């Protein structure tokens, strides 16, 4: 895990796109390519479509998984099954 000298980590464009989304409530999913972003507790309730590699998978965030990275919930390997 990241050293505690830097708690959060969000790309600046993502911040300025979601810091707008706090004054006005959740109204539209945010299309995101940054998988390294750390979700802060004060954006709970929004829908974020994270880039899988082909399409953007949308996810909803609540307080339970605040301590996790964005792309952690978006897998990239299919594995439909050997048989």
């Amino acid at each position: 895990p990241r050293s505690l000298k830097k708690g959060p980590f969000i790309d600046l464009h993502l911040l300025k796109k979601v810091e707008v989304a706090v004054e006005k409530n959740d109204r539209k999913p945010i299309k995101t390519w940054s998988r390294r972003s750390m979700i802060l507790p004060h954006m709970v309730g929004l829908t974020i479509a994270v880039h899988n590699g082909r399409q953007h998978v949308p996810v909803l965030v609540n307080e339970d998984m605040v301590g996790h990275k964005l792309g952690e919930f978006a897998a990239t390997r299919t594995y439909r099954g050997h048989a």
């Binding site: 996810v59 339970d64 998984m65 996790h68 952690e72 919930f73 897998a75």
Partner: protein, 114 residues
Amino acid sequence: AGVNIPDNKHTVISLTYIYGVGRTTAQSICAATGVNPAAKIKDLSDEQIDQLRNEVAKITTEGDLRREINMNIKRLMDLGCYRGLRHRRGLPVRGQRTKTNARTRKGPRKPIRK
């Protein structure tokens, strides 16, 4: 006697058994309520066994440990997280090899078709 602690052994050696205390925190408990580590637990007066019970009950052991581990694991599968998703398959979650040599988390060989 805790939860059926063994006798005829050194205090800390038997104190490793309470399922939540190893050897370091076991020695910490032994030195907190000062008793001889080299003394056999059989020759231990009951006037300190109650203090050892207090020390054990301070943090956790057996049942509470089961509860906490299982609740922690349960909030992983439901969340849709990658760690829980792999934890739902028997595959290792830290990121070891899977092309081969993932045996401790797949049990027997279970050969193809037979």
